[PDB]
Amino acid sequence: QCGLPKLMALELFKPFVMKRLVDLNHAQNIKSAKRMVERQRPQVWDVLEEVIAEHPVLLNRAPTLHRLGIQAFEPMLVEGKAIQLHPLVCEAFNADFDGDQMAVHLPLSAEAQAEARILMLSSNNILSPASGRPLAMPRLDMVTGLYYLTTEVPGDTGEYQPASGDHPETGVYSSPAEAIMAADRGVLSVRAKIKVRLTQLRPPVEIEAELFGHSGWQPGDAWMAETTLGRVMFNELLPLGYPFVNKQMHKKVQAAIINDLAERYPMIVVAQTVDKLKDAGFYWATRSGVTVSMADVLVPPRKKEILDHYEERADKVEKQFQRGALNHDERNEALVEIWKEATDEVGQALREHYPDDNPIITIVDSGATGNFTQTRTLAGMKGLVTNPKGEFIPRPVKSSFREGLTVLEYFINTHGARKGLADTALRTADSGYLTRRLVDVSQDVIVREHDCQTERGIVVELAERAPDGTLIRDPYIETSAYARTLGTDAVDEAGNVIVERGQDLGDPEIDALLAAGITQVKVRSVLTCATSTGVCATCYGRSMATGKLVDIGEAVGIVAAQSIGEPGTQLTGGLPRVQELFEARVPRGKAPIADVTGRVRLEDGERFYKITIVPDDGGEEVVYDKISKRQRLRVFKHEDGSERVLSDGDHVEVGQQLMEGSADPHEVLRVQGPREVQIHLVREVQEVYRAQGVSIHDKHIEVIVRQMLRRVTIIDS
Amino acid sequence: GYDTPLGITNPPIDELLDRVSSKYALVIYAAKRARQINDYYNQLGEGILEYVGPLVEPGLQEKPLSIALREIHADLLEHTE
Amino acid sequence: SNNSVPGAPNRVSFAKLREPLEV
Amino acid sequence: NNPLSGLTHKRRLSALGPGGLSRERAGLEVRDVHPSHYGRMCPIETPEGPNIGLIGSLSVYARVNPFGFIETPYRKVVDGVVSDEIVYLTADEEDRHVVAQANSPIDADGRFVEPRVLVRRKAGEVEYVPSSEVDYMDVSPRQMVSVATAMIPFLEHDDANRALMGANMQRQAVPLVRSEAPLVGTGMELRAAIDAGDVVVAEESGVIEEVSADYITVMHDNGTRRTYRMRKFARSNHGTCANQCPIVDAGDRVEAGQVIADGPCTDDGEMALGKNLLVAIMPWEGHNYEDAIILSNRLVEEDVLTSIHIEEHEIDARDTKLGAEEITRDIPNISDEVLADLDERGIVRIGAEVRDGDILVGKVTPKGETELTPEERLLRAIFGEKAREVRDTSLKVPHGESGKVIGIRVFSREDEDELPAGVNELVRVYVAQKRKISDGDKLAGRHGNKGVIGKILPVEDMPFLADGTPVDIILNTHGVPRRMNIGQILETHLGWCAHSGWKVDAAKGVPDWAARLPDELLEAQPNAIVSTPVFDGAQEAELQGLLSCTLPNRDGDVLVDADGKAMLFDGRSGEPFPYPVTVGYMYIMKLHHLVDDKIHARSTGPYSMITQQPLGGKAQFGGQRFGEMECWAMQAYGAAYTLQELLTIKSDDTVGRVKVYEAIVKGENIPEPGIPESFKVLLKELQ
Amino acid sequence: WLSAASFQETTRVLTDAAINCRSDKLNGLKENVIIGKLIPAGTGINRYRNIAVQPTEEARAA
Amino acid sequence: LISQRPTLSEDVLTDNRSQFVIEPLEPGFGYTLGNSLRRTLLSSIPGAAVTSIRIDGVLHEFTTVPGVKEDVTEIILNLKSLVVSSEEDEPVTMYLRKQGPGEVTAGDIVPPAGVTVHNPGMHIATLNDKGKLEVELVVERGRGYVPAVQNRASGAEIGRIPVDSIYSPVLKVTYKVDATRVEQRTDFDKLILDVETKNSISPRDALASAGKTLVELFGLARELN
Amino acid sequence: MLISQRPTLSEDVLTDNRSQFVIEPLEPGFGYTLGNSLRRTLLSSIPGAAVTSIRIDGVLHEFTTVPGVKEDVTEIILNLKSLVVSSEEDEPVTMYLRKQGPGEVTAGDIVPPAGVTVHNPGMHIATLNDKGKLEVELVVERGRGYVPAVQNRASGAEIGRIPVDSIYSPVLKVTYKVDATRVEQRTDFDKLILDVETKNSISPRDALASAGKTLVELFGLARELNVEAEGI
Ligand SMILES: [Zn+2]
C-alpha cells in the first residue's frame, strides 16, 4: 500500500471519475461531469474512492538505478499533499525523507495493470535481484526496536532465581500471557531471563527432537524455555511452526531469518511477516530509550596520556629529521604510522569506557546505522585528514567534534570535506556512464530456451582444506557457488552421489556437499551456455529476486547491467579499474604472463629485468624484458608453498601470472583460451566490488563477459 | 497457513503461480480474460456474441481484473500456450 | 553584553576573547 | 527569500561568467579550499550542487582593494606584544609574515603566555614558533567564516558537510507571520539584519512624533522631520511576504542608527529565521523514520510556522487580426455565478477568495468563422447562439493556487500608459495565501539537519512533560550521530537553559566550572537570549554546569535533569516513557520547499507542438518524464505492455491518446497503441 | 544501426549505415522502444503474447 | 485485597486551576485514567470562540487601518487570544467602536445578551489621533479547533474576514500517580489530576464535561450484542 | 458541543473463550483514549478466584522434587496456577487434593467444597508413579488482577506452605490497535479493535460488559461534579 493525496488521485483518475459521475447520475452528461471534477463538487470524493479500488499505481524515485527503483502499490486516499511511502521499500528506492520527491504513473490497459499487479508489486519483490538477500527488512528504527526486547539483561527485575532456602524457584511463569500480566504490574521486565511454558511456538529443532522427535511438535503441546518475555513476543511475529530462536536480534540475525523465510515459506507469508516486524520494531524503538545527549558522548579517560606518548614519538621523529637522518618524503610516512597507531589507541579507549546502555553504542552495535569510526570521530579524535593532494597531513586533528576543533583544525578539515563532495558528483557520472554502456551491450540477452543440454560448465572452489585438517569455507561461495545449477553429479569418496545434476544449489544442499568432504563442483554457467542468441534458463541459474529458476523471457541482460551499475556509486583499483576490464584495455599494471609452462630462468640485474623460460616439452627459450620497478607475485609453486617468490628453478604453469599487477586480458586469451580469460575477468571484477562491501553474484558479471567473446576475427577468408 | 490476504494481495500470489508456468504467463492470462469480462459488462445490454460473463460471484463494483484473478485461482479457466 | 553600539536587545555572550575590530 | 538570502547574494563571489571559466572547464582544483582563502573567502558557505566551489561568500571582515585582491585585517604584534594597531594585508602580503591564531593566550599588557604558539605560515603550514616571531595575529576567531556561516551556533562541533547545508538552508527560510528571535544566538543576527537593509533604521536622533502601521515620523532635535514609510505585504522576488512593522511607540526617544522598525525574519532587529520549538529526541512509532519530522498541531493552531505567500498573475488585451481583445465581464456561455466575484470591468474584486480555475480577468478574443470545427459549427447552429464570434481567453487561477486577492493594477493604452505596441490593456492581480505548516513541508535547523513533516499529531497525542506541556517537534535519534552535527544537541541543551533560566551557587565562592564565564551569565531569567560566537562561546564544561542549576517552573519542580533529559508521558496511552529523553528548545526554520508548490499531477493537457509529447514543469501543467533509466527498469521487470503504454498512448500517439480518453469515459477497454509521432519526425529529419 | 545510432557516435554510425546500405530487422529491446512495438522480452515475446484464453465448460445457469 | 469504592475530591489552587485526587484505584490503573481524562479535556470540552470578524475600512487581512499601529493581520493574531463564552449556541455578533487616541482593549467590546468577555484587559490595537477602529465579531459555539471557514464554502461576501476558531476552554492538563508498592496484601494507585482552564469555565466544570463524555462513550461496551 | 452519532460495537467470535470487538466509528482521536483504558480495566478490575497458596505433603525444606511423581515441585505449581476456579465466598477457602496408586491426577480428582467450582476437570496436574501417593492442600481467594507470590508470603503457615502467583483476573490476554475509517468525508475517524482472550469462567462478552460498568461508575465520579452539557 501507498498513500497518494486525494487531490492527486482526482486529477490522475479524472476520466475514470467522470465516467462514474455520469453512471450514478451525479452528473447529467459527460460534458458536465468534467466541470464537476474541475470544480471539485463534493460528490467526487465519494466516487473517487470507488474508482481507485484495487487499481495499482507505479511509484518512482530518480535515479532509477535498478529495477526496484519503480514499484507498484495499492493506492489509499489520504488527506494532505504528500505521498505516503512504506518504510520497508525505502532501501530499494534509496530514499530518505529530507525533501525527496517521487513520481506516480497510472497504468490504463488491462495488461499494464496486470504487469503492475504481478510483476511490479512491492510485496512480490522483497529480495534484491542482484544478490538474492532481502531489502524490505527492518533497517533503522525497526532493527533497534527488535534488538531491544530480544536482549538478555542479568540484574533485570523479575529474573529467574533458583530454589534456595524456604522459597521455591522464583521467576517461572505458566503462560506467556501471565508474564505479560507480570510485566504490566511492574514485577517482570520484558528483557529478563525467565522460564515460560510455551504452547503455540515450535521448539528449536535441537530440543524438538528430544521432546518429541518421532512426530513434529503440535500446536497445543507444551515445553519449557529459558528466554525473555520479549524474545517470546518476537517469535510470535514470525509464522506459526517456525523453530524458536533464542538469539539476540541483530540486523544480521533478522536478515538470515527473512532470507530463510524467502527460501522455504511462500511469498505472501514473507510479505505479511515483515509487516509484523515493522510494526513491532517501531513500537519498541519508541520505548527503547535511544537518545542523544551531551552526557552520553563520553570522552576517553586517558585522552591526555595517550596523545602525549605519541607527541613524544612525533617529537623524536621530528628531531630525527632535524639532523637529516630521515628523508623528507620518509618523515611524512613515519609520522603517518605514528598517528594511525594513535587513533587506534584512542578508539580502543572508547569501546571499553563506553557502557552498553549508552545509546550511541546501542545504535551502531545493533545494525541500525553508523560505524564506530563515526563514534570515534565524534568522541575520541578526528584523526589524520587529507589535503587536496591525497596523502595524509603529517599533523592530525587531535580534537573531537564533542570537544570542538580549533580555528585552524576546522579549516584544514574542510579541505577533505569539500573535495569529498566535489568528486562524488563526478564519480556518479562515470558510474552511470559505465552503467548505460553495460545496458546496451547486454540489452537483448534474453532467456529463450529451457535447457541447451550442454554438459559444459566450470569448476567452482567450494571450500579450501587447511593444512591442520579442517576445511575452511571459501569466501567466494556466496557470489560464485550459491544459486548455481549442477552440470556434473557431486561424488564424494564413496560411490554415492550427494546432489544430482541439474539441481539448484540451495542452502542445505551446500552443507550436503560440505559435510561430504567434496570441495569442488562443476556447475552450469551462462559462459558455457551454447545457444544461438540468448541463454537457456538452466545454465543461468536461480533468479535472485524470484528465489526460483529464471523464467523464460526475462531480460536477464538488463538486470545484470543494473545489478553491477547500482553499487558503482561507492568506489575509488576502484571504478577506473572496473572500466579497464569491461573495455578490454591494455591495463596500467601490464603484468607479464607465462606463455609456456616449464622452468624459470631468473636473470635479474639492477639496470633492468630480463627473464627466460625453458619449455618443459620441446620448444625454445622465450625471452622477456621488464622494468625493475615491479615485483614478482608469490606464485603457488609445486612445493605447495603459496609464498614462493619466483626465483629461478620454480615450476610455473602455462598462463601463470609472473609479476604483480593486472595481466593483459588480451594476452590471457591467446595463452589459456576463451574459457579461462572469461574466468579471469569475472573474479577480477569481483575483487573490486568485494573489496568495498558489495556482494554481486558472479552470474551477472558473466552475462556481460559472454557478450565480449561472441565475436571472432578472420585470419584467412 | 497465512493471514487473510487483504486488498490487491488477494488472491495470494503463491497459489496463483501454481496454475501457471511463470510470472509473465499469468499476466497475459489475467489481462486477456479481464478484457473478456469488461466486454461482457459493455455488451450485456446490446448485441449477441458477447464475451463469456464472470464465472464466480462478483463483489459489488468489483474490478474486472480482480474478478478474472479469482476465477484463475478457482481453476475455472483454461489456457493455450 | 553583545553589540552595545546601536541600542539593540541585550544578548549575553559566552565570550572569553575581546573583539578589537567591529564588523 | 529572507533578509539573510538578500545579504548573502550581494556578498557572493562567483567564478563563472565572461573572462572567468566555463563550468565544463573547471577541475576539482579550482573548487576546493585554498590556504589563502583564510579570512577572505568562506570555506563553508557554498552550494552543494554543480556550482560547488565555483561560488563563494566573502568573509566577514574581508574587503577589496582598488586593485581587485581581497584584504583581511590583522593586529600587528611588535615584539611579542599585542597592539591595537590594525592593518589590512593582501594574500601575498600575508605570506611574507607569520600570523598567530586568534585564540592565543595573551597577557593584559599584550605578551603571549607561551613561547611557542600555533602560527600559520606560507603554503599552509601550521607549527609552533617563538613569541618573538609573531608579526601579526587574527582579529576575531570567526575571521574565516562568512556571514551566514557565522550564524550557526556551536559551528565548531559540526562537520563541514552538514555545516555547508546549515548555512545554505538558512537563506532558504520563509518569512513567517510573526517572528521570534532565537534563544541560542551567535551575535551575528543583529548586524546581519541591519546591514541587509530590510529593517528600518533611524537616520538621525529624535523623538517619535506620529507612529502608524503605514509610516513612522521622527521629530529631530534641530527641528526637521523625517518620515519612514512601511513596506506592507509586498511580494518578494520569490513570492515571500516582505512586511515591515514598527517597533517604537508614540513619544519614544530613539538614537541615530537604531532600528525603529523591522521587516521579515526580524525580531527587535535580529535575524529571526525561525521559531524556538520544544524538541524531544526520540523515535516515535516510526512517524519520524530516517529524517522524517513529527509536529504538534499547536504549530498549526497558533500559526507558529504559518507564512504568507504572494503570487503575481498577469494578462493583457492585444490587437488581433480580426479585431481587438477586450477585457469584459461579458464572457460567452458563462453563468452569472462564476462571474459573481468580478466587478463591472471583468476583473476580480479586492478581497474575494479564489480557488484554482476561478476567473481573475475576463478577456475575449475574436475568432474567425473559417477556424471552426465541423462539430463546433453544428453545435453553434443547434443552440441558435449567433454573434458569438469571440472565444474565452480569460485569466484563470493556476492549479494549486488559492488565496485572497489583495491588489489590482490596471494599465491601459487609452489612459496614456505606455504599453508595448499592439497592446490595449494590462492587468496585474496579486493573490496572497496564508500557508500553515502542512504534511511534507520541509523544515530544517541551523546545523544542516533537514527533514519533511511526516505527521502532525493532535496536541494530546504528543509526548508531554511532567507538567502536561506537550512537546512541539519530535526529532528522530537515529539521524543525529551519523551526520556529526552535535551542535543541534548542544543547542538543545543551551536552548532549555535559556528557556528556564539558571542560578549558579554563589555561596562558598564561584564554582570551578564558571570561573571563565562572565559575571553576567551567573544568573539568568526565563526566556533569556544568549550568544555563542563561532569558534568561541559556550564550552561543554560550562554547558554541563548550567543544566545542573536550571531554574524550576511555576510549581517549583525541575523538569529536566542534570544530564539534559526528562521523563515524558505517552499521550496516546498514558504510561510514562520507560527512560528519560533529551528535551530542550531548538531553532527550526521553514524552508521554501513547501508541498503547496511541490505537488503536481496531470491526466491530460498541452503537448509540445513539434514533438507532440506532453509539456514539462508544473507551471505548464506538464507530465512527468519517464526517462531512459526508467525504461531499463521496465524491461528488467519484463513489463512490456506497461512500457509500450507509456511511450505510445500516454505520450505522443496522436490518435491513440484521444481514443484512450474516449475508451475510459465509455467504459470500453483500452485500444491498441499506434505509432509514435516522434518517430515520424525522426524519419522526416533523416531525409 | 538504430540501436547503435542512439548510443554513441551518432554521425559516425549513420554515415557507415547509408554507405553499406544496412537494413535493420526491427527485433530488439532498444529498437521496439523507439517504434512503439512490444519489447521481445518478458510478456512481449511471441510465446506469452499470442495466447488464447477460453472458459472451462462448467458455468452457472445464467 | 478486596474492593473499596473510589472517591473523587477537588482541591483548588487558583480560580482557573484545580487538582483532583481519585483513590483507591487498582495498581497500574492510575496512569490510564488520568490520560483518558486529559485527552478528552484537551480536545472535546465545549466552548465559544470568534468565527469571523468584519472591519469597515478593510476588505481582507493583508492591509492596514489609518492611525492604528498594528496591521489587520497582527490585530487578528491578538484576537486569537480572546476568551469568550456564549449561551446562544447560534451565530451572534459582537461590536467594537473606539476613536483614538488611546489603546483598544478586550473590554472595549460590547457583547450582546448571552455572551461575555473574560479578559477585558487584553491588548488589541494602539490608536493615535487619526485612528478610528470599528470591528464586528461573530461568535459561535463549538468544540476543539476548526480552521477558518472559506468564503466559497460559506455564504459570506467579500467584506467578511474568517478567523481560525479555538473552542477549547482548558489551558493545561497533567497528572501524577503515587503507587503503593509495599509488598503486602494491599496495593493501590492514587491518581492526581491537574486541570487548568482559561477563565471561561471553572476546572471542575471542564472535568464534568469530560466525565459525561466518557460515561456516555464507555456505555457502548455495556450494551450486549 | 456538537453531536457525534453512530458508534456501534460488533463482535467476532474466534473461540468460545476469545472474541474480537470493534468500536466503530469513534471521533479522532478517541480510539486511543478509551483504548488503553478498556484493556487495563479488563486485565485488572474483574473479580475472579485463583489458588493463593499450596502445601504438598512430604515437601518441607526441599522444594526440589516430590517423591512418587514424575513432575518436580515447580512443574506442579504451574499447572495448578492455570487451574480455573470460581468462588461465591469472599473469605479464603481451603481445598484438598488426594489420590494414591499409579495413575494420573486431574483437576476432576479434586474435591471442591461448597461454593467453589472447578471449570477444567480434565486438566492434567501430575503423573503418579508406581505405588505413588500425593496429598496437596489448595487455598482459593477472591481478588482482581494479578498479584505476585511475594505478597502471599504471610498467607502461608510455617509448615511447608508455599505461596504462588494468583491469576485472579478472568481474562488472560488483551491487545488493542486503532485504525482509520471514513464516516462522511473525514478519513481519520478512529476504529478501535479489541482482542480479548479469557478463561472459561466467563465469555468475552460479559468480560467487556463488566469493564464498561466499572468504567461508567469511575468516570461517573467526575460527571457528578456539575452535570454540564456535552454532545452525544
Ligand atoms: Zn545453457
Instruction: Give F121 to chain G, closest Cα distance, Å.
Output: 28
Q: Do G189 and G212 reside in the same domain of the chain? A: yes
Q: What angle do CA B33, B35, B39 make, to 5 degrees?
A: 120
Give the neighbor-by-neighbor strand order of the sheet with G8-15: G8-15, G18-26, G189-198, G171-181
Q: Which three cell numbers stand for residue D375?
A: 462539430
Contact C8 D257 (CB under 8 A): no
- A40 and B CB contact within 8 Å: no
Domain that holds residue B61: 1-81
Do chains G and A meet with 3 or more Cβ pairs nearer than 8 Å?
yes
The dihedrals phi and psi of E2, each to the nearest 5 degrees, come to: -75, -35
Contact D669 B31 (CB under 8 A): no
The Cα-based distances of F38 to D336, F167, G30 in angstroms read 51, 16, 12
Give the sign of the dihedral formed by CA G25, CA G27, CA G28, CA G32: negative
Contact F181 A184 (CB under 8 A): no
A476 within 8 A of A461, measured Cβ to Cβ:
yes
D223 within 8 A of D209, measured Cβ to Cβ:
no
CATH of the domain at F188: 3.30.1360.10
- F28 and A CB contact within 8 Å: yes
Instruction: Give A112 to chain B, closest Cα distance, Å.
Output: 8
Please give the Cα distance from A534 to A445 (Å, whole number).
Answer: 5
Q: Which fold has domain A294-424?
A: Topoisomerase I; Chain A, domain 4 (1.10.132)
Question: Which chain G residues are Cβ-neighbours of A182 within 8 angstroms?
Answer: 146, 148, 165
The dihedrals phi and psi of D188, each to the nearest 5 degrees, come to: -70, -20
Q: Which three cell numbers stand for residue B24?
A: 509473465
Q: Do F34 and F105 reside in the same domain of the chain? A: no
Do chains B and G meet with 3 or more Cβ pairs nearer than 8 Å?
no
Q: Do G79 and G117 reside in the same domain of the chain? A: yes
Please give the Cα distance from A549 to B21 (Å, whole number).
Answer: 11
Element holding D679 (H helix, E strand): helix D677-686
The dihedrals phi and psi of D307, each to the nearest 5 degrees, come to: -135, 150
Q: Do F64 and F108 reside in the same domain of the chain? A: yes
Q: Which three cell numbers stand for residue F38?
A: 486529559
**Strand ranges inside D155-222, DSSP E:** 184-185, 200-201, 206-211, 215-220
Q: Which three cell numbers stand for residue C1?
A: 553584553
The HSE-up count of residue F111 (CA atoms within 13 Å, CB side) is: 23
Answer left, alpha or beta for residue D143, where phi above 0 means left and psi between -120 and 50 means alpha. alpha
Q: Do F56 and F124 reside in the same domain of the chain? A: yes
Contact F62 D308 (CB under 8 A): yes
Instruction: Give D85 to chain C, closest Cα distance, Å.
Output: 9
Instruction: Give D147 to chain C, closest Cα distance, Å.
Output: 10
The Cα-based distances of A403 to A515, D173, D540 in angstroms read 54, 30, 7
Q: Do F103 and F138 reside in the same domain of the chain? A: yes
Q: Which of A103, A53, A102 is nearest to A74 (CA)?
A: A53
Contact D573 G35 (CB under 8 A): yes
Distance A526 CA to ligand 1 centre (A): 6
- B25 and E CB contact within 8 Å: yes
Spell out which chain B residues touch chain D, with contact meaning CB-CB distance below 8 angstroms: 23-24, 27, 31, 35, 38-39, 41-42
Query: How many residue pairs from chains A and B have C-beta atoms closer than 8 A?
Result: 86
Which residues of A carry a binding-site annotation for Zn(2+)? 452, 529, 536, 539
Instruction: Give C18 to chain D, closest Cα distance, Å.
Output: 8
Contact F6 G218 (CB under 8 A): yes
- G32 and D CB contact within 8 Å: yes
G37, G222, G232 ranked by CB distance to F216: nearest: G232
Task: List, in sequence order, every residue forming a beta bridge with F123; answer none if it has no partner.
Answer: F105
Please give the Cα distance from F70 to F103 (Å, whole number).
Answer: 11
Q: Do G143 and G66 reside in the same domain of the chain? A: yes
- Minimum CA–CA partner of B13 in chain A: A268
Interfacial F residues in 178-207 facing G (CB < 8 Å): 183-185, 187, 201, 204-205, 207
Q: Which of A221, F66, A10 is nearest to D214 (CA)?
A: F66
Distance from chain centroid for Cα A596:
40
F211 within 8 A of F95, measured Cβ to Cβ:
no
Q: Do F24 and F61 reside in the same domain of the chain? A: no
Give the sign of the dihedral formed by CA A376, CA A378, CA A384, CA A389: positive
User: What is the CATH code for A141-287?
Assistant: 1.10.274.100
Please give the Cα distance from G140 to D80 (Å, whole number).
Answer: 91
Please give the Cα distance from A185 to A173 (Å, whole number).
Answer: 14
Among the candidates G168, G201, G217, a domain finishes at G168
CB atoms within 10 A of CB B74: 12
Give the sign of the dihedral formed by CA D221, CA D222, CA D227, CA D228: negative
Element holding G79 (H helix, E strand): helix G73-81
Contact F20 G222 (CB under 8 A): yes
Q: Which of A30, A20, A26 is nearest to A43 (CA)?
A: A26
- A106 and E CB contact within 8 Å: no
Q: Which of D46, D56, D52, D48 is nearest to D26 (CA)?
A: D52
Give the pairing type, strands D241-242 and D234-235: antiparallel
Contact D101 A407 (CB under 8 A): yes
Task: List chains touching B (3+ CB pairs under 8 A).
Answer: A, D, E
Question: Which chain F residues are Cβ-neighbours of D466 within 8 angstroms?
Answer: 174, 176
Count of structural domains, chain B: 1
The angle that helices D540-548 and D487-500 make with each other, rounded to 10 degrees, is 40
Distance A577 CA to ligand 1 centre (A): 29
Please give the Cα distance from D361 to D313 (Å, whole number).
Answer: 10
Which residues of A carry a binding-site annotation? 96, 98, 100, 452, 529, 536, 539
Contact D643 E35 (CB under 8 A): no
Q: Do G148 and G43 reside in the same domain of the chain? A: no
Q: Which of F142, A34, A91 is nearest to D290 (CA)?
A: A91
Q: Which three cell numbers stand for residue B4?
A: 487473510
Please give the Cα distance from D670 to D663 (Å, whole number).
Answer: 6
Domain that holds residue G68: 48-168
Do chains E and D meet with 3 or more Cβ pairs nearer than 8 Å?
yes
Q: What angle do CA D687, E1, E4 make, to 5 degrees?
A: 115
Question: Which chain E residues are Cβ-neighbours of B25 within 8 angstroms?
Answer: 48, 51
The experimental method behind these coordinates is X-ray
Question: Which chain F residues are Cβ-neighbours of A186 within 8 angstroms?
Answer: 27-28, 179, 181
In the numeric block, the cell 507571520 is attached to D177
Q: D202: which DSSP letter?
A: -
Find the radius of gyration of the CA atoms of chain A.
31
CATH of the domain at G164: 2.170.120.12
Q: Do G92 and G156 reside in the same domain of the chain? A: yes
Please give the Cα distance from F184 to G150 (Å, whole number).
Answer: 8
- E37 and D CB contact within 8 Å: yes
Q: Do G160 and G177 reside in the same domain of the chain? A: no
The Cα-based distances of A279 to A86, D284, D286 in angstroms read 11, 12, 8
Count of structural domains, chain F: 2
Please give the Cα distance from D522 to D545 (Å, whole number).
Answer: 11
- D556 and F CB contact within 8 Å: no
Helix (H, G, I), strand (E, B) or coil at D78: coil
Most distant CA atoms of chain E, gap in Å? 68
A49, A78, A184 ranked by CB distance to G43: nearest: A184
Give the sign of the dihedral formed by CA D496, CA D499, CA D500, CA D502: positive
Spell out which chain E residues touch chain B, with contact meaning CB-CB distance below 8 angstroms: 42-43, 47-49, 51-56, 58-60
Which amino acid appears at position D220 of this protein? H
- G40 and F CB contact within 8 Å: yes
- Minimum CA–CA partner of E52 in chain B: B80
In the numeric block, the cell 572508547 is attached to A350
Instruction: Give E60 to chain D, closest Cα distance, Å.
Output: 25
Contacts of A710 by beta carbon, 8 Å cutoff, 6+ apart: none
Between the two ends of chain F, the Cα-to-Cα distance in Å is 33
Q: A62: which DSSP letter?
A: S
Please give the Cα distance from G187 to A6 (Å, whole number).
Answer: 11
Please give the Cα distance from D429 to D351 (Å, whole number).
Answer: 11
Task: List, in sequence order, every residue forming a beta bridge with D428; answer none if it has no partner.
Answer: D314, D409
Among the candidates G146, G168, G190, a domain finishes at G168
Element holding B38 (H helix, E strand): helix B23-42
Q: Which three cell numbers stand for residue D423?
A: 497592446
- A185 and F CB contact within 8 Å: yes
- Minimum CA–CA partner of F142 in chain G: G1
Q: Which of A121, A58, A68, A551 is nearest to E45 (CA)?
A: A551
Please give the Cα distance from D510 to D541 (Å, whole number).
Answer: 14
Contacts of F92 by beta carbon, 8 Å cutoff, 6+ apart: F86, F112, F114, F115, F138, F139, F140
Which residues of A carry a binding-site annotation for Mg(2+)? 96, 98, 100
Contacts of B32 by beta carbon, 8 Å cutoff, 6+ apart: A110, E51, E52, E53
Which amino acid appears at position D379 of this protein? L
Please give the Cα distance from A325 to D572 (Å, whole number).
Answer: 72
- B10 and A CB contact within 8 Å: no
Distance A501 CA to ligand 1 centre (A): 14
D212, D436, D468 ranked by CB distance to F172: nearest: D468
Instruction: Give G231 to chain F, closest Cα distance, Å.
Output: 8
**Resolution of the experimentally solved model in angstroms:** 3.9
Q: Do G36 and G91 reside in the same domain of the chain? A: no
- F185 and A CB contact within 8 Å: no
Task: List, in sequence order, every residue forming a beta bridge with D240; answer none if it has no partner.
Answer: D309
Please give the Cα distance from D538 to D543 (Å, whole number).
Answer: 7
Q: Which of A95, A83, A184 is nearest to A136 (CA)?
A: A95
- D458 and G CB contact within 8 Å: yes
